[PDB]
Design a binder for this molecule. Structure first.
Ligand SMILES: NCc1cc(Cl)cc(C(=O)Nc2cccc(-c3nn[nH]n3)c2)c1
Lengths: 39, 156
């Protein structure tokens, strides 16, 4: 039995930690909602 | 139940202790999460019940109490923020420039940030604070790292 609990407001934080790259990937999406890489 | 707008953890007591299986967004009286988090099951909010209203396995999305309300889209140029809500940890904003998923049916924004599976459903926001999609359905690339699509529904 699943339940929900509030965790916060949805707001943009000024000067938040900035990280992660921006990869451009060729992908396929199947009928089960799973993404896979196309090579 | 609590119906105030915001980000919420999705928990279960079926396993050992209380386990966080995902996250979602309450907006305009509707709870939004990824299908793989709930598998379309009903949810509890205090003494109240939330019943599924719309869902689709291929999009990996589900809404409760009403139709999908989130319609903001990534502009294709700007940095965004993942409001990550990791299991047992405080909500935290992470800024990033999305990459792209190129598909036969069009391009989708993607965020190359790696969090535990129980973070699925955390919202990705634009600079106006609008939810442009949910984090948690993606791929594992040739370095073991994780890249999630920016998954957004359609507002009828
Ligand atoms: N640590 C990387 C990571 C982060 C996040 Cl936020 C999510 C995942 C992940 O596994 N997502 C996913 C997608 C689609 C189906 C399922 C699933 N199906 N059934 N039970 N889970 C699970 C992985």
């Amino acid at each position: 039995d699943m339940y929900i609990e509030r965790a916060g407001d949805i707001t943009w934080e000024k000067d938040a930690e900035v990280t992660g790259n921006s990869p451009r990937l060729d992908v396929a999406l199947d009928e089960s909602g799973d993404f896979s890489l196309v090579e | 139940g609590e119906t105030t707008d915001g980000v919420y953890r999705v928990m279960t007591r079926r396993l050992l202790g209380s386990t966080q299986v995902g996250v979602g967004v309450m907006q305009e009286g509707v709870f939004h999460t990824m299908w793989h988090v709930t598998k379309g099951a009903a949810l509890r909010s205090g003494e109240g019940r939330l019943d599924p209203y719309w869902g689709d396995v291929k999009q990996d999305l589900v809404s409760y109490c009403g139709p999908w309300k989130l319609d903001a889209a990534w502009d294709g140029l700007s940095e965004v923020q993942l409001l990550a809500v990791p299991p047992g940890e405080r909500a935290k904003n992470i800024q990033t420039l999305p990459g792209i998923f190129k598909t036969k049916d069009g391009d989708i924004g993607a965020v190359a940030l790696d969090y535990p599976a129980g973070t699925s459903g955390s919202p990705i926001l634009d600079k106006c604070g609008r939810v442009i999609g949910l984090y948690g359905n993606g791929v594992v690339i040739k370095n073991g790292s994780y890249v999630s699509a920016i998954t957004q529904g359609k507002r009828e």
